[PDB]
Structures are given as C-alpha cells and as structure tokens.
Design a protein around this ligand. Structure first.
Ligand SMILES: *[C@@H]1O[C@H](CO)[C@@H](O[C@@H]2O[C@H](CO)[C@@H](O)[C@H](O)[C@H]2NC(C)=O)[C@H](O)[C@H]1NC(C)=O
Ligand SMILES: *[C@@H]1O[C@H](CO)[C@@H](O[C@@H]2O[C@H](CO)[C@@H](O)[C@H](O)[C@H]2NC(C)=O)[C@H](O)[C@H]1NC(C)=O
Ligand SMILES: CC1=N[C@@H]2[C@@H](O)[C@H](O)[C@@H](CO)O[C@@H]2S1
Ligand SMILES: CC1=N[C@@H]2[C@@H](O)[C@H](O)[C@@H](CO)O[C@@H]2S1
Lengths: 237, 53, 190, 237, 190, 53
C-alpha cells in the first residue's frame, strides 16, 4: 500500500551494509549494548514482493513471514556478537520465535498482558527490561505520575531465578508529538516516578509521602534550570 | 526532600551550618581518586553550585 | 555547628576514566557530621549518586541560613538498568536539550539514555562510512548529529554516570535509511 | 467535611463587601462584562450550618439549597446592574432556576448533553457562550486539535432566533496542572483549532487542508517566540 | 514587481482610544497590489486583524526573497466572542507569560482573555479597597497582581484588540477570599 | 498558510517583492486615524518586525 517497506532481508548487500555500518557503531558508542530494535515489522510489503516470495520457498518458510524476520534478525545478532557487543531487542523478536543467543536482553513494551510476557522471557532464560507501563508519550489528564509510581515491576509469575533476570526498566518518551518546545515539561517530573520505583525499595510506596517529596524535588529541578511541570495546584519557593 | 528515597536514612535533630565561600568538596587522602580524576573534579564543582546557587 | 568539608573516599579502583556498564557499582554511604562530612563509595559511580543526595539534604532556613541535619545514609539501587528513551527521528532534538535531559537524569539517578536516534521520518545520525544516510535522510542539514555531537553527548553522559545506549532500529522503522542506501529497502508493489 | 465552605449568603456584611468590592472591579476593568462565576457550589456546608438552616425556613426555601444559591446570585447580579455592567455566568446559575435579567450571558461548560443546554438557554432568550468541548486542560494522546476543530457549535436544536443568541466560545486552560513551565506548549496550537472554528466559515472543515496550514502556522508562532508544540512528526524552516 | 507601501485606511470613527467590546467591528478588506497595497477597515479592530493576515501572506522564497502574491481578501468573524480562559489561582502566572499569551491570541485572532484571576487555592488580585484579600490570600507576596500589573495587561490586550474579561467567581471557589475577609465564608460543622 | 482562513481569498499568480528597509506601513490620507493613533502606530511597527524579522 506504501512505496517502500522494511529492509530487504534476502540480499547479500543488506548484510554487507549492516556489517560495515554496525562495525562503525561498535567504535562510536562505547556501551557494551546496542539496541537492534525489531519492533512492528510489516509483512504486507514482503508478502507482495515476487523476489521475496521466491526466497521464501528457497528455504521452506512457506507463508510464515515471522521466519523471514527471524532469519534477518539472527544475522544481525550474529554481526553484533562478532564485534563483541551485547544486543537488546524489542519483545517481537522473542515473540516471533527467533533464536537468541544467551545474554540477549529483551525489552518488554506491549501493555497487553505484560507480566505474562515477563514470565515467558525470563522462563526462557533471558534478561528483561520493562517499558510497557511507562509510556510517557501517552499523556492523559491529572496525576498520572501515580500510576507510573504504583507499578511494582516484579509482580509477575515466576521463580526467584526468573526475577533475578529482571534487570530494570525505561521510561519512554516517543517523539511523534514531542520536540524542544515541549519535551522537558512532558518528561519531568513524570519520569521521576519511574526513577524512584527503579532506585528505591519495593516497599517505598506511601502516596502522601511521595507527593510531599516529589513536589519539593520538582521545585528543585526548576531551581536548577529544568522546567519540570507541576504535580497539582501550588507554588515553589 | 530526598528523591529517590535512599535505601536507609538515619538523621539526628542536630543542625549544622555551611558557609559557601568556606565549604569545599575534596578527595579524602586514603581515596583511590585524586585531582587527576576529571569526573570527580567536575562533579565537585557543579554540586558546589547546586548546593549554594 | 559547622560542616567545613565534604570528604569523598573511593575505596576500590575508581573507574574514573572508564565508561559505566550494567554491573557498575553505584552503592555509597554518606556520613554528615561536623567538622568533616564523608561520602564513601566503592567506585566513582556511587560517589556521583551520593553527591546528588548530599545536595538534597542541604536547605536554607527561614533566614537564609544554609543548614543540614547530622545523618547517615546507606544507599544502593534496586535495579541497575534505569533508562529514559528519547526519540530524535520523529523530531530532531538540539544537542542542548539532550544535555539538559542528562542533567535531569542525574538529579533523578537515571543511568541509561536510550537514544532512539533514527526511525522512518528522518535519519540525523551522520555516518562517516556512509555519508549519504544523513545527507539524504535527515530533515535538513542542520538536523544532523555530527561525530562530535555524538562524542559530546557520550562524554557529558559519562561524567554523570550515564550510559548512552544507541538504538538503530531494523528491519522495520527504516524508511529514512532508504534515501541514502539504495537497494536496502523492499519496494512495495501497491 | 472541610473547614470552610462557600460565601455565606445570609449575612448583610457579605453583600456590603461584594458591593464595595465589585464597584472597585467596575472601575479597574473597563470591559462591559464581569464574569460572576457560580459554578460547582457545594451545599453540604450550608446544609450543616444552623444559622443557614434558620435563614432557610425564614423565607420558605425548605431543604432546596438551589433557592439559596439563586437568592445569593440574584443579589450579586443586581449589584452588577446597579454599576452598569453586564454579567456572565456559568450554566449552573441558569440550571438551578435563578432569575436572570435579559442580557445575562450564560457560559455552557458541562460536556454532558451540551447541545440541549444550548437549546434551553437560547429558548429562554439568553445569549450563550460555549466552552464545553474545548477544555484544553483535559489533555490526551495524539492529534486532539482535530476533535476541537471538528466541533460545529450551531449543531443544536433551535430556531434561527436561538442560533442568533449563540455569540461565541472560549477555549479553557484551567490551572490545576498548568504553570509557566508548561502553559504555552499546552495552549498552542491546540487553541488555534478553536480560533479557526470561531473565526472562519462553518463550511471550512477540510482536515488535510487544516493540517497543512496549521503546521505552517504553528511554525510561524515558533518563529515569533511562542513555543507552540508540534502537530505530528516533522520540522520547521 | 515592488510593493513599496501598505496603506491603512480606517473609514469610520477609528475607536483608536477606546476599549473593544462585544459588538466591535472587526471586518476588513486587503488589496495586495503594486506599488501600494491597501488595508481598509471600518475601525481599528478590523485593521489589526488585517495586519495579521497581511503578515501571513508574505513569505521568503528559496533564495531569501521576500514575496507576496497579488490578492484580494474580504474577511470578518463568524462569532464575536472568541476567548481563551487562563487560571492564575491554581498557579500564579507571571505577567510576562500573560503578555505572551496575548501575542499568541492576536496571531490567532482571539479577542477575549477570560481571566479566571482568583479561586480556592490563592487570591493574587491586589485590591485597593481590600488590601488583606491578597496579603493573606496570595501564595506569597511575589505571587500578586498589582494595580499596575492589571493595567499593563489591560493596555497590552487593548493594543491587540483584545477584551480583558475578569472572573471573580462566587459563591463557590472562594476559599482564598476567607483568609483576608473575615466572616465572609461559611464555617463547616465537620 | 493563512490561519484562521479568511472569509474570502482571491489570489493571482503575479508575484511581487518587498524590500525591508524600503517598505513602510502608513496611514492612507483619507483615513480617520493618523500618527496620534498609538494603537495603529505600535501595530505598524511590530508587524514590520514580524514580516521581516
Ligand atoms: C533535623 O533537625 C531538625 C532540628 O532539630 C528537626 O526538627 C525539629 O525536630 C524537633 C524534635 O524532633 C522538634 O521539636 C521541632 O519542632 C522540629 N523543627 C524545628 C524547627 O526544630 C528535624 O526533624 C530533623 N530531621 C529529621 C528528619 O530527623
Ligand atoms: C502565487 O503565485 C505563484 C507564482 O505564480 C503561484 O504559483 C505557481 O502557479 C503557477 C500557475 O498556477 C504554476 O505553474 C507554478 O508551478 C506555481 N509555483 C511556481 C514556483 O511558480 C501560486 O499558486 C500563487 N498563489 C495562489 C494560491 O494563487
Ligand atoms: C517499541 C515501540 N515501537 C513503537 C514506536 O515506534 C512508537 O513511537 C511508540 C509510540 O508510543 O509506540 C511503539 S513503542
Ligand atoms: C466552570 C468550571 N469549573 C470547574 C473548574 O473549577 C475546574 O478548574 C475545571 C477543570 O477542568 O473544571 C470545571 S470548568
């Protein structure tokens, strides 16, 4: 329906480009991990392409484009492993049955049944990062800092071993409706709710006390040049 | 007004005062870091500004 | 009555010149007493967190007097990956607002900037080996992150104990990649 | 349940205070109209007060506190009329059956069945202002400018005469969650949707064309120092 | 090729020194032609709207050349009350951000600033006859609008053809009024 | 890029140019307003800035 779709995973020029490209990235960014993405891959374009249809039957993927996605992603993960970096991946890569090397971090972003996603990912042995309940781009009326604060990330089903695989989370501010004019007030102090939940003890959840310290903290951010938005009616100083 | 709330906080009622032009943040003599540590030196200077500014 | 000094003691190899990673030790203790307060941490990363906490304990009373309570704090994080995702493809974000975000992250003890640097709408990452990715994929030539912009963000982040986690999303979310890399994207029949 | 409730409408000191006060307002603000409010008056405090209970039976208001509210508001409207200014009032004053002098503008803010509110107000002869569908403080994800833009304010039931009584509207940015750090990006360009709907012709409603001109207009606001937030992905210049 | 001048013709008594009101005439016509463009309006109010429109017609081409198309515009508003409500009780808004809002209102042809000046949480309106309303009801002494702040907002608004509609809400929404005016509010038994 | 869209807009393809330091906004001689009109004078000056700035 569009003009161009996803990266063409059947061409050797693709993987040759990605090799050279990711090698540059392994040098520019010193962090051990590179996020390869893998979210929301559309198959309609691959399905409608004759050369891809040919490639699909060449190795028995039938009409299952999850296998072509897996095939693509496995080659990229292998490129990351060869340059001695770790890989992070959005949950779709795990859900669509790609073969991930041990160590691969899976970032859980889909808000539907996310605890059960956490169980599945951890049960399969993989380290997990949670972002699903902390989509700060999804704005709403009122004190939504509380709903982010009330999340207890380890309330999913699993053994201690699985819960040890939960390494943390991220508060996400996607950019469709965000730029320099509105980023800071949208981000802070709503992201401060997630920061306490990820830093402080599990049992730190008194809402009144959280409100008391966060308004004062927010005023502190403002004093330091961060235009963090209010929690409710009031003033600073 | 701590955020995030530290793991363990124990305070006394004893108040102490600080003088901006007579308060320094420095390396303890037993430390493994010293003046060579740009990271700690820059942090010392900017937190001095945050505490008093 | 007077706290004259805050002494900072790093106990193990400082990691002063290193980049932080998932297992970095961010624990510290803070002893506020007279005449010398003490911040102790295994590494640099914990001292940075402890400096933030110390600053949150100092306040001015009703007459402007800088005050702090005698106290002891033991602290270490519940989880080690504490991230903020920013997206500089849907809209370009000037380097300055990324640096401000890192400052706010430090004040909140966040330690990962998840940089969703490219996506369908634009490709601001200037690649040395592939100059056409940004030259044809960026919104304009002033909506690009130069190698030096990238280094600046990485260094600025490191000085606050923040890891810069780059995301170069594929195979989807890659429309801007096709402007500069010919034959990479799948053409759609319809 | 609280400590203090609404203004005490049974005391002569109240009306003596309001007289002196509103006289000052009639001098400070040159506009012909003064908005007297009258929204969300709580009766529990009046109901629980013995002196008010006494006053209630003194002139047969029974247990109907709408009559005490009406009694209060009518005295304030009379003060405004005596200083030769017009009055504007939130819909509750009209809904709770107060006697309004001809000319009194009624501002319709309740989002439930607002068209039927417009019919009732206009059918009774009063000029009306609409704010109900344009609560800009009620933020939500996405292109909510469109829902404000798609409002056709004269789609309520009534004769031409009633529709001639509809004099306009207001986009409201209530302050519980708004201050200097976030007012401008929240307000603009979402309020620009309401501005076109209130300025331009009724039949100006092509969404694609509206999107085209509003992104460019929004970029214009930014160039002129108004930090208006984006409509969607893109850039300016 | 050159538009050297934009001539502005007010046809009736200008209303230059008056405050706008509900029935103010905001109609105008704009004739863009060379060498002299003409903006014609019954009153000052229509000329102000027409100046805004003229500025939206001028653009710079790809080489920076200031350009405008020959054109004719006839314009007048569908409704005469076009308002923005701001609330300075839930949070105090500095005078500067009110002036900026008025500038943005002018760019959008809004003509009423509905100033919800006071409410339960604070009373920033400084009353001359009742000084205690703000002295006891404001958030602090720097969160007040002086008589001069009020005049400035009114004048700034008038210069853009904007009416300042004050709201002093009663009988509800008046908690801050009770701090300075004793016996005004009803005490709650519970 | 008009906002709000005017009631009636009729344009030609004929482009005309403006010179910032040789473009004035002034009172037509038949107007009821003149230099005394602060409101129009201030508007002339600020719209000059908006058109060119
Ligand atoms: C920090 O020290 C102050 C000053 O002693 C503490 O505040 C007072 O606590 C005493 C006894 O607990 C009370 O009598 C006072 O009313 C408190 N305020 C004043 C003005 O002195 C404060 O509690 C200490 N901080 C903590 C959390 O321990
Ligand atoms: C304003 O004038 C310009 C220039 O003539 C108009 O633009 C062009 O229109 C002609 C004929 O309609 C086309 O051949 C060109 O492709 C257009 N652009 C260029 C670069 O010349 C423009 O349409 C006019 N504005 C309106 C709305 O009438
Ligand atoms: C992973 C994800 N991929 C998508 C992004 O491309 C969007 O920007 C975001 C907006 O909420 O939603 C999901 S999160
Ligand atoms: C009239 C109105 N009275 C109320 C206000 O006090 C609130 O601030 C506003 C918030 O949406 O809701 C209604 S609108």
């Amino acid at each position: 329906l569009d003009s161009f779709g996803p990266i063409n995973p059947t061409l050797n020029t693709t993987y040759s480009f990605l090799t050279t490209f990711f090698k540059e990235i392994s040098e520019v960014f010193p962090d051990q991990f590179i996020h390869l993405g893998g979210d929301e891959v559309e198959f309609k374009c691959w399905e409608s392409n004759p050369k891809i249809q040919d490639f699909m039957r060449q190795k028995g993927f039938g009409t299952d484009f999850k296998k072509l996605e897996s095939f693509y992603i496995q080659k990229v993960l292998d490129i990351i492993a060869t340059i001695n970096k770790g890989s992070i991946v959005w949950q779709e890569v795990f859900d669509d049955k790609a073969k991930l090397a041990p160590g691969t971090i899976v970032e859980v972003w889909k808000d539907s049944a996310y605890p059960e996603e956490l169980s599945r990912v951890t049960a399969s042995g993989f380290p997990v990062i949670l972002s699903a309940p902390w989509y700060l781009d999804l704005i709403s009326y009122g004190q939504d800092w509380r709903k982010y604060y009330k999340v207890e990330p380890l309330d999913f089903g699993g053994t201690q071993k699985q819960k040890q695989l939960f390494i943390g989370g991220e508060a996400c501010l996607w950019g469709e409706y965000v730029d320099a004019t509105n980023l800071t007030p949208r981000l802070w102090p709503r992201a401060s709710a997630v920061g306490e939940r990820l830093w402080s003890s599990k049992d730190v959840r008194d809402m009144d006390d959280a409100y008391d310290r966060l308004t004062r903290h927010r005023c502190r951010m403002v004093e330091r040049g961060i235009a963090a938005q209010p929690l409710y009616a009031g003033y600073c100083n | 007004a701590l955020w995030p709330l530290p793991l363990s906080v124990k305070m006394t009622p004893n108040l102490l005062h600080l003088a901006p032009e007579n308060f320094y943040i420095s390396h303890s003599p037993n430390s493994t870091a010293g003046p060579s540590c740009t990271l700690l030196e820059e942090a010392f200077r900017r937190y001095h500004g945050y505490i008093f500014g | 009555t007077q706290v004259q000094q805050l002494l900072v003691s790093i106990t193990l190899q400082s990691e002063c010149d290193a980049f932080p990673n998932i297992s970095s030790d961010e624990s510290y203790t803070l002893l506020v007493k007279e005449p010398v307060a003490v911040l102790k941490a295994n590494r640099v990363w914990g001292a940075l967190r402890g400096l933030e906490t110390f600053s949150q304990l100092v306040y001015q009373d009703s007459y402007g007097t800088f005050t702090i309570n005698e106290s002891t704090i033991i602290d270490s994080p519940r989880f080690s990956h504490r991230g903020i995702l920013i997206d500089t493809s849907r809209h370009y974000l000037p380097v300055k607002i990324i640096l401000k975000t890192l400052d706010a992250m430090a004040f909140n003890k966040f330690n990962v900037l998840h940089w969703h640097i490219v996506d369908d709408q634009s490709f601001p990452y200037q690649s040395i080996t592939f100059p056409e990715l940004s030259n044809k994929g960026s919104y304009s030539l002033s909506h690009v992150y130069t190698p030096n912009d990238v280094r600046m963000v990485i260094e600025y982040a490191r000085l606050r104990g923040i890891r810069v986690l780059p995301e170069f999303d594929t195979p989807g979310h890659t429309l801007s990649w096709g402007k500069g890399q010919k034959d990479l994207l799948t053409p759609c029949y319809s």
